[PDB]
Structure 1
């Protein structure tokens, strides 16, 4: 059972700007997703300080980067706080309407796409490199859900019958045909070292057969 939703008009506009603007510095999508994962991990860590049972769903706080050249996917997995169904529908837990407004004012006032995370909508930088994004998530207070969008103005939400996650979020990037450099180990390592060197959680880059 799949529910299809329209993006708010401002988010659709943000997504088409990300997709259509000529902008060569695409590698910053990975910094933005890792930063989102770090923020999610901070949230469950804070809640566990006063309630250790919040970690019954998984004690380890970490980030995995999983390239798969056969599927042409790069998956960013974290064991952070996760998202409820309502979070997913409400722009993946962001204040994306007001953040898009601020971001687009900044852009015509000098800024470039790389500053997107200062406006709280860094998730959407995934569409620099991905034709489709699937987000699988599990919050302690809800069931496991899958969000998906190929842009074009709509997204879907369904209950996820896939492999149970425990707690956290998995962002599966279905890469564009010409963006497969972000499946190569040396390229991913370079980007993590350049932009994510002070993330306070282990980032494990999986290797392939």
Structure 2
């Protein structure tokens, strides 16, 4: 059972701006997604202090970067708090509405796209390099879900029958044909060292066949 939802008008507008604006400094997408993963790991770590049973779904707090040239995907995996169905459909988009409008105002005043994270909508920077984004996520209080959008004003949510995850979030970036540099090991290392050097969780860059 696949449900299709329309983005809020403000978010669809932000997504089209990110897709259509000429902006060469695309590499900042990885810093934003890694920062999102770090925040989610901070969250489950905090909650586990007063309820250690919240780590029964996985004690390890880490971030994995997994490129796949065969599928032309870059996957960012974390074992953070994860997102409920309500997060995916309603809550996160509701927060992102004010941050979007503020970010658009700043862009008209002289700001640039790399400052998107200061407005809390850094996830959407994924569409600088991805034609489609799939988000697999599992929160302790809900089932495993798959969120997906190729932009165009709509996204889908379904119950995920893939491999069980334990807890956390997988962001699968289906890269644009001309953005395959972000599948190369030395390019990913360079970006992580430049923008994510002090993340307080182990970041493992997987290597391919």
**TM-score of the alignment, normalized to the shorter chain, above 0.5:** yes
Deviates more, 1:155-164 or 1:85-94: 85-94
Root mean square deviation of aligned Cα: 0.9
User: Who is 1:37 aligned against?
Assistant: 37
Where structure 2 has 5 or more consecutive residues not aligned to the other structure, the ranges are: none
Q: Once the 2 structures are TM-superposed, how far is the Cα of residue 90 of structure 1 from its aligned partner? A: 2.2
**Number of equivalences:** 209
Q: Once the 2 structures are TM-superposed, how far is the Cα of residue 91 of structure 1 from its aligned partner? A: 6.1
Say if 1:130 and 1:203 are closer, same or farther in 2 by CA, change over 3 A.
Answer: same
SS across alignment from 2:26 = coil
Q: Is the 8 A contact 1:94 1:120 kept in 2?
A: no
Separation in 2, partners of 1:150, 1:94: 20
**TM-score, structure 2 normalization:** 0.99
Q: Once the 2 structures are TM-superposed, how far is the Cα of residue 108 of structure 1 from its aligned partner? A: 0.9
1:37-85 superposed Cα distances (whole Å, 9 cap, x missing partner): 0000000000001111000000000000000000000000000000000
**TM-score, structure 1 normalization:** 0.99
Say if 1:70 and 1:183 are closer, same or farther in 2 by CA, change over 3 A.
Answer: same
SS across alignment from 2:148 = strand
Separation in 2, partners of 1:192, 1:29: 11
Where structure 1 has 5 or more consecutive residues not aligned to the other structure, the ranges are: none
SS across alignment from 2:71 = coil
1:89-144 superposed Cα distances (whole Å, 9 cap, x missing partner): 12646611000011011111111000000000000000000000000000000000
